[PDB]
Design a protein around this ligand. Sequence first.
Ligand SMILES: [Ca+2]
Length: 312
Amino acid sequence: MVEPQHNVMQMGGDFANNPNAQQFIDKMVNKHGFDRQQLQEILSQAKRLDSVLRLMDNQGPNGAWLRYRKKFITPDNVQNGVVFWNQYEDALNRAWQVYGVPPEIIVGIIGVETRWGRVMGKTRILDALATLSFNYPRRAEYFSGELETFLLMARDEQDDPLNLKGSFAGAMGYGQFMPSSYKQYAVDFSGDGHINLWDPVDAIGSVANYFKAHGWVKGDQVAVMANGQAPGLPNGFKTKYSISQLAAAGLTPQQPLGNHQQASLLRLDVGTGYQYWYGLPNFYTITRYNHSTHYAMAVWQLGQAVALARVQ
Ligand SMILES: [Ca+2]
């Protein structure tokens, strides 16, 4: 009946003779009460994906912004965004009330991430995380922490760890949450007692919670386009200047900046020239999801495009 298999100490598969896999198993048994044999059976089936390693290694004016933008803001995406918004309007309104994060932001995030569930990833999370944890020295510690959290998540939500699929980095569901984000920010917004990253209602609430946790200020402006050019100043979502310094550089805000006394200097390559913007705190909050000016600007404008298409 019961087979302890204490004598079965060596696993097969792609990670069969991997010291890192061995230490990881020891950590899981010692720290979380995992059964060594059960974990070896799971990891023996895990695959080392060289494509995952290659991708992790892989990461004017000529119209840069324009090319990036058109990958996301298209008639098909805006129309599908409208459908998702209307279909999950209650969840979106509830997220606005509970977290102060507006529907266009959540709709924009889920649209840029997975096109509202159409592209959620085809890689087994276990394969990606074991590959990155056991055969990638550069970020081995970070991904080992993710694999740990993933296996704990699977155990708790009662999922077979080998059934879940996602990105080459192990990101999951509608919002493409990493295991650590599931742990720190995912909420059971649907109220069934389970946190499911593949349930659009849960994902909606989880994205909203993530935003509020990262400082989203309800009702505050995201960014305001500037009149003028500021070629002498370094730009990017990480920059920071007082409104006074930006004015001295030849900029004026197209909309009143309220009480904001500083801002980041954003610059978009619109082909014919450069379009400068005053980046406000909420814009930076969007970059917390993906450290990129283009990313955050596309999330915001896609959400705006859907909001408008809904009014029609
Ligand atoms: Ca749920």
